[PDB]
């Protein structure tokens, strides 16, 4: 079986390289594209890059990309792959939904069942069996997906399962937990920096900062699909897991804390944490953002808050934001960091920021306003 493989993060666009750095940290080489990151590794590699990881939403085996204009070509490519190197006997192999773009091969469908033929026909080829008897398929799922760019397929194995910002602790248009993740290591939070965001919706930015704080991998209470995996040595998942428990640091005290003037949010966001056992980590509660006062110094802030041009009239998203400035501004020595989609965020603010950085929140771009905080001499 396969023991060396090409891999894929990937990841929203415009946190490609917070993917990329967090490889580095893992100690992988990486090319970063647009909406992927391409990395190199054995089987442990896919291991610990499915529980490490914060801010990719899945981890791919590319298991080879070809030329196809026809569905012949199609058929051939794929079944030249070497599935005998992946897919054991009796396993399911379910393929796709497919996607195709710019490509003369449109049909999704088509495109589906023909690679879904090709890679029967190869194992059947390989393991000795007739060819016009189906294959039994009731092991363990390989998924398998297939993508078509201007006539050239790249077909592909998901390692991952469920994406991963589906960490297993939201309960309950949360941004996605993979996203949260990215932002805080945009920032420049540090465990022995208070923490706040004043818009929590759900918990996610709490939940992420705690999660990063004590540095708990990101998948510790959540499986993988290629865990199931025959071939994949259950000795190392094991110790994989067991590592990543003792790099935890349960004991750090961290000062996090977030709060939303929806009393329904407060709700789901206490759930959540409970989920993950940091009921006593994370102080939530019901409260206006225009409240808030500290006289803690050095903090990070960070707010995801209502959007512009959605659900909220422009008059009082303008209030809004002109009254978190006028809140926000004797945080003198906090750094404070804003995504929204509003353009003009700055002159509602009041204050123009020290960096920006283009982001998208789902299809939406959406702007991360960064204002740095000043040591008082
Ligand atoms: N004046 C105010 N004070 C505190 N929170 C407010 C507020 N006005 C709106 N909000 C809250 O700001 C949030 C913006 S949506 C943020 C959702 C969050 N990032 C998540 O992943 O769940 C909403 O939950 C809304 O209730």
Known sequence: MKKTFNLVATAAAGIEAVVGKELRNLGLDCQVENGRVLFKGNIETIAKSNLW??????????????????????????????????????????????????????????????????????????????????????????????????????????????????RGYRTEAPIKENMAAAIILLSNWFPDKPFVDPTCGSGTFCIEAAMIGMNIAPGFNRDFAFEEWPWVDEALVTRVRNEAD??????????????????????????????????????????RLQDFKTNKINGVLI?????????????????????????????????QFILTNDTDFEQKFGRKADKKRKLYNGSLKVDLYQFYGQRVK
């Open 53 to 166: 990881l914060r801010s990719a939403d899945r981890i791919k085996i590319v298991v080879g990309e070809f030329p196809a204009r026809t569905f012949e070509e199609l058929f051939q490519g794929v079944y030249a792959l070497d599935w005998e190197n992946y897919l054991p006997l009796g396993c399911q192999f379910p393929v796709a939904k497919a996607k195709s773009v710019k490509s003369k091969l449109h049909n999704e469908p088509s495109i589906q069942g023909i690679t879904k033929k090709a890679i029967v026909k190869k194992l059947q080829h390989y393991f000795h069996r007739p060819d016009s008897v189906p294959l039994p398929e009731n092991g363990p799922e390989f998924k398998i997906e297939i993508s078509l760019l201007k006539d050239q397929a790249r077909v592909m194995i998901d390692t991952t399962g469920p994406s991963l910002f589906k």
């Open 246 to 287: 003792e790099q935890a640091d349960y004991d750090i005290q961290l000062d996090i804390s977030g709060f939303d003037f929806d009393g329904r949010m407060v709700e789901i966001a206490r759930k959540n944490a409970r989920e993950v056992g940091l009921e006593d980590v994370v102080k939530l509660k019901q409260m």
């Open 303 to 335: 707010s995801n808050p209502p959007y512009g041009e959605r659900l909220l009239d422009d008059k009082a998203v303008d209030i809004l934001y002109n009254e978190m400035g006028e809140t926000f501004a004797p945080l003198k020595t906090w750094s």
